[PDB]
Amino acid sequence: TMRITKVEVDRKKVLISRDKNGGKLVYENEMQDNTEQIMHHKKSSFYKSVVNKTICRPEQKQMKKLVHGLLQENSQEKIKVSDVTKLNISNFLNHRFKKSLYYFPENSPDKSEEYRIEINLSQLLEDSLKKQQGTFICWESFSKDMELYINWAENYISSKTKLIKKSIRNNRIQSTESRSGQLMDRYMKDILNKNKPFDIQSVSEKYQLEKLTSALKATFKEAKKNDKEINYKLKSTLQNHERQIIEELKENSELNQFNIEIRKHLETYFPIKKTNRKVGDIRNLEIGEIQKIVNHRLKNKIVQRILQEGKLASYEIESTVNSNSLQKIKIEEAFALKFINACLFASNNLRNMVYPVSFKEIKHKKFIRQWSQFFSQEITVDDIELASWGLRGAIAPIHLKKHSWKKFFNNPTFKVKKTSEFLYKETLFKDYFYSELDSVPELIINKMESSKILDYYSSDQLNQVFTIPNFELSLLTSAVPFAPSFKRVYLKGFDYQNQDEAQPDYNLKLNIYNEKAFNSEAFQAQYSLFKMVYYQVFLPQFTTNNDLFKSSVDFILTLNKERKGYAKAFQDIRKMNKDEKPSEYMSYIQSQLMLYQKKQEEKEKINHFEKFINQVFIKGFNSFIEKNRLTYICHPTKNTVPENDNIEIPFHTDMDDSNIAFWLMCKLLDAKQLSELRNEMIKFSCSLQSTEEISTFTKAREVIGLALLNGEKGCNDWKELFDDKEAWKKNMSLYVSEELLQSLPYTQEDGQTPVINRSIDLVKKYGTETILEKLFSSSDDYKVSAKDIAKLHEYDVTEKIAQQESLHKQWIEKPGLARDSAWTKKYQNVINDISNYQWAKTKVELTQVRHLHQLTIDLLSRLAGYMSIADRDFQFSSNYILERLRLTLEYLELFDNRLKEKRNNISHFNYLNGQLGNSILELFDDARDVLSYDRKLKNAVSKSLKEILSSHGMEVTFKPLYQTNHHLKIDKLQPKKIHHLGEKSTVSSNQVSNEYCQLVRTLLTMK
RNA sequence: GACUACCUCUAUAUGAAAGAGGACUAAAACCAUAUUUCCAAACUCCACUUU
């Protein structure tokens, strides 16, 4: 009934299999027409739907089995006649059986008034039980008198199971044998031959639109005192209008279409099945607006018709289009899409070296200074013909077609024109790549030297973590699509170990998830050491061993389905076979997660596949760390003798110099742009079939790992970024601007020797430095004050944080202190002291500039991700016309050269070249001028602005669109709240601050 | 319903096309950008925001 598909039938699952011949209801891994007998088993649930179609909201438990046992012979159960059935039977039925119900048999000879049958179920049920004279009910006698009702349900079930079964077999790909698909096929062919497809005013007169919208407004301005049911009785006045003009609704097929779109208009603004939440407007119902919208959302279906079989010509697939073949295109257009937006951000970085505004105008002194930040080496004066032409040949060599991914990462040569090609082997770049590879065992040590680690652990306790046999501190990290991050593993693992022990205990037998207190340096040693033993030593081995991975899944499944009752959530996901690779069982987990994405959101149910992937990886990291002797990490214990014994670590790699161009692209990316690329690459790698071409991807997925070790080296000396103290003091006075620069946080230890700031050089590496000098120079309350350093001495935060943890733990034993009006104010003042101290600490070290830089990149890279779908749709509708160019496309009102200007500067990152032109909120306004192509992509442009800012701790409101001449303008920007101590209280705290939010708005609206 | 989607099929035009389907089409979710929110467990089918 409700779910035909995605439902068990014979302890087997059900899928649909669309095809150009028709539709098919198939089991799971098979290919047979089983739509006849899947639909036959799906029939005890049709009886269960009719019983809930004849019974009411106080779902009574004695009328529930009287009705159900008439329909099912086996289901009938003995009940008493008189005592349990003596109520108001008329007040327990449905709202459809309260009054007499009339119908015609399914296959009646013809419509007539002598065929329609009458039924009063409240009358016909009282007349039988008085004729029932036994102590208990007799099924043979009762069924015989209820014969008038049983034929209603057998008619109801048998006709609905015929409508669903025809809705499936005709649901084919790109149908033209149907009504309203043949009609859109008629309209599409009358535009390529440049004609007019339809006329609104001539079809508005046959529909008699003015007889409607006058009766619709009447039903709106008439009564409707109660907000509930207003929406239901605009449906019935619309069903009344169709009834009087039905004689030509069956005879036109274009008039009929006019009714389907105006029906669909009504249940999106005056909803009936769509979670109301808002009072309707009378503006929508007015005549001349609905006709404008019908013109607007019927052309949407013509443009979607053109692109959807222009896709079937770019692949050579338009006769064998299959449901299975279509999915395969969805996947390889995700790896190819994520790979493009990385090249647009790497190409931006190559712009700022050469010419930020192409080879002729080079600032010569800036180039060498810019080169030393990406690459840790130093270039000569005589190499800028071979370095600036050598990098561009790594990014340059979008056509959405059949890709062959071998000879896509190789690229042996690059050309230099004044044309004379070089290899990358007899070049200066070769020395850089090899130098990086042979310094891996000391880049680990400097990552260990920093963030304590060596100051809290002894060197004998570190020579037995890189010395474990079968683990070699790889640069590879996983061979699986859905693996967690480490902070999801360690934080959620704290939740399973530390648990109340006062329950139906769900023990996982964990021991290493000990602390959570981030305020110490002892814990930040073991957190940083666990982090790198779970990424280099453990993730590669675990993911490729069949026995190690399987032994953790088999503990998890048998921990769940071995306790009493039926409520067991890991019920329908199967156990790992023997001789099965872990990249083949976790491709089963990924596919189940994405087929059940809609069924889990129709009803309010949680994603139970997420908390399965946690517990396997949480338990398996404990079994690793205890089978070896690696359990001393849980006790740091700061040492006294600085031990001068070396930590010798073994490492060997077979990377040849065929990767010496893709490494030059990964050195121009970020640290977040690199991690995301690697996650999409492991999804696309786990669906390919060849034994080669996967070794292409696992050799480039190791180049990314080598790039990550460096990441944020930056500078170390002082006078390599500046020349004098007066140029340092000129630049740094744009953010603090005082006589405060000769102090402790801003000079080294004594005298006048400076210190360089890690969030300020980072802005300079990228091109966002100019923008942030315009932001902080608008006001003067943005810079570091003398009172902000003065607040960092008012008191200590360690004695306040401790107080908060103590007061919170007492609330678990005494929840009644939530209504203690004196206690809840003391807890409020402790939170606001921790909050105000942490904003002043961040402001003093200029950490926020780092936050502003990250926030700006996310907004401009999302906008470059809509301009790549629009570019893919432009070449999908153009190559269809050239197979049958501009004079047709400017008759379809598609891509102009006024919108190609807007689509080009969004994609080419032209916001960052200093001078503004137009703000950020005028780039989201320009994105939905290009994407007015369809509503699916236009409606989502503003939906993704609010999601990005909401992840960074902020809300946003956006004034109504008809008042602002269709532009985006801010109403309210406010810090988002956390709601300490329960869910129905007033004790809360802002996620960021009111001061950070003001800075953010002055960035979004800044011309 | 810009946020607060969309598109294919389906007709005894009505207890209603108020029905089914979408990894098939978009957006999220997942991912190596520090820390305050108690936590863990909670099967399937069928209903359900008016009357």
Q: Quick check: A197 and A187 in contact, CB under 8 A?
A: yes
Question: A739 is written with which tokens?
Answer: 């006589």
How far is it, in rounded angstroms, from Cα A55 to Cα A63? 8
Radius of gyration of chain A (CA): 35
**Backbone φ, ψ for residue A758 (5° rounding):** -75, -25
- Length of chain A equals 1007
Which positions ≥6 away from A768 have C-beta within 8 Å? Answer: A853, A856, A857, A912
Question: A632 is written with which tokens?
Answer: 């001393």
> Which 574-593 positions of A have CB less than 7 A from strand B?
587, 590-591, 593
Question: A169 is written with which tokens?
Answer: 């077999």
The answer to whether some atom of strand B lies closer than 7 Å to the beta carbon of A937 is yes
Could you tell me the distance in Å between the CA of residue A477 and the C1' of nucleotide B34?
22
How far is it, in rounded angstroms, from Cα A6 to Cα A12? 10
Identify whether A399 is a catalytic site residue. yes
Q: Which nucleotide is nearest to A95 (CA to C1')?
A: B51
How far is it, in rounded angstroms, from Cα A33 to Cα A30? 10
Which among A277, A399, A793, A898 is annotated as catalytic? A399
Q: Quick check: A362 and A354 in contact, CB under 8 A?
A: yes
Tokens 């007033």 correspond to what residue?
A986
Using the CB atoms, write b or e for A126-158: b if 16+ within 10 Å.
eebbeeeeeeebeeeebbeebeebeebbebbbe
Q: Is A809 exposed, middle or buried (0-12, 13-18, 19+ CB in 10 A)?
A: exposed
* Nearest CA-CA partner of A263 in A252, A274, A271: A271
Look at residue A488 and give its three-state secondary structure.
helix
Q: C-alpha distances in angstroms, A803 versus A386, A978, A990?
A: 61, 19, 19
The answer to whether some atom of strand B lies closer than 7 Å to the beta carbon of A570 is yes
**Backbone φ, ψ for residue A147 (5° rounding):** -70, -20
Could you tell me the distance in Å between the CA of residue A991 and the C1' of nucleotide B39?
22
Which positions ≥6 away from A186 have C-beta within 8 Å? Answer: none
Write out the E strands in A77-123. Answer: 101-103, 117-119
The answer to whether some atom of strand B lies closer than 7 Å to the beta carbon of A536 is yes
How far is it, in rounded angstroms, from Cα A296 to Cα A292? 6
How far is it, in rounded angstroms, from Cα A217 to Cα A299? 27
How far is it, in rounded angstroms, from Cα A493 to Cα A619? 9
Chain B nucleotides close to protein (CB under 7 A) are: 1-51
Q: Is A791 exposed, middle or buried (0-12, 13-18, 19+ CB in 10 A)?
A: middle
Could you tell me the distance in Å between the CA of residue A889 and the C1' of nucleotide B13?
39
**Backbone φ, ψ for residue A422 (5° rounding):** -125, 160
Look at residue A954 and give its three-state secondary structure.
strand
Q: C-alpha distances in angstroms, A439 versus A473, A531, A538, A565, A706?
A: 14, 21, 22, 58, 10
Using the CB atoms, write b or e for A657-673: b if 16+ within 10 Å.
eebbbbbbbbbbbbeeb
Closest CA to the C1' of B25: that residue is A936
The answer to whether some atom of strand B lies closer than 7 Å to the beta carbon of A946 is yes
The answer to whether some atom of strand B lies closer than 7 Å to the beta carbon of A787 is no
Which positions ≥6 away from A514 have C-beta within 8 Å? Answer: A497, A634
Identify whether A850 is a catalytic site residue. no
**Backbone φ, ψ for residue A19 (5° rounding):** -160, 155
Q: Quick check: A22 and A172 in contact, CB under 8 A?
A: yes
Q: Which nucleotide is nearest to A527 (CA to C1')?
A: B34
How far is it, in rounded angstroms, from Cα A197 to Cα A100? 48
Q: Kindly state the DSSP code that residue A575 receives in the 8-state scheme.
A: P
Q: C-alpha distances in angstroms, A622 versus A501, A516, A609?
A: 20, 17, 21
> Which 33-72 positions of A have CB less than 7 A from strand B?
45, 48-49, 52-53, 57
Question: A252 is written with which tokens?
Answer: 């036109």
> Which 213-272 positions of A have CB less than 7 A from strand B?
228-229, 232-233, 235-236, 239, 242-243, 246, 249-250, 256, 259-260, 263, 267-269, 271-272
The answer to whether some atom of strand B lies closer than 7 Å to the beta carbon of A499 is yes
* Nearest CA-CA partner of A1002 in A730, A778, A667: A778
How far is it, in rounded angstroms, from Cα A529 to Cα A452? 10
Please give the biggest Cα pair distance in chain A. Answer: 112
* Nearest CA-CA partner of A72 in A145, A143, A164: A143
Q: Quick check: A387 and A372 in contact, CB under 8 A?
A: no
Write out the E strands in A15-89. Answer: 15-16, 25-26
Angle at A791 between CA A789 and CA A793, to 5 degrees: 90
Question: A178 is written with which tokens?
Answer: 């149907």
Question: A598 is written with which tokens?
Answer: 């809609």
Q: Quick check: A641 and A682 in contact, CB under 8 A?
A: no
Could you tell me the distance in Å between the CA of residue A533 and the C1' of nucleotide B31?
18
Question: A853 is written with which tokens?
Answer: 């830089």
The breaks in chain A (C to N more than 2.5 Å) occur after 357, 397, 418, 884
Could you tell me the distance in Å between the CA of residue A394 and the C1' of nucleotide B23?
33
> Which 323-342 positions of A have CB less than 7 A from strand B?
323, 326-327, 329-331
Q: In chain A, where are the structural domains located? A: 43-169, 182-298, 323-438+658-710, 456-634, 847-1004
Tokens 């096929």 correspond to what residue?
A185
Identify whether A608 is a catalytic site residue. no
Q: C-alpha distances in angstroms, A139 versus A50, A87, A93, A142?
A: 20, 20, 21, 5
How far is it, in rounded angstroms, from Cα A236 to Cα A917? 52
The gap between the terminal CA atoms of chain A, to the nearest Å, is 56
How far is it, in rounded angstroms, from Cα A647 to Cα A42? 66
In angstroms, this model's resolution equals 3.2
A758-765 and A364-374 helices, crossing angle to 10°: 120
Q: C-alpha distances in angstroms, A426 versus A409, A410, A414, A657, A660?
A: 19, 16, 12, 11, 12
* Nearest CA-CA partner of A174 in A16, A22, A5: A22
Which among A678, A701, A903, A928 is annotated as catalytic? A903
Q: Quick check: A697 and A685 in contact, CB under 8 A?
A: yes
Q: C-alpha distances in angstroms, A365 versus A351, A592, A689, A760, A852?
A: 16, 56, 51, 20, 28
Using the CB atoms, write b or e for A296-323: b if 16+ within 10 Å.
eebbebbbebbbeebbbebeeeeeebeb
Question: A454 is written with which tokens?
Answer: 């060596």
Total Cβ atoms within 10 A of residue A982: 11
**Backbone φ, ψ for residue A610 (5° rounding):** -75, -40
Q: Quick check: A262 and A234 in contact, CB under 8 A?
A: no
Could you tell me the distance in Å between the CA of residue A314 and the C1' of nucleotide B25?
18
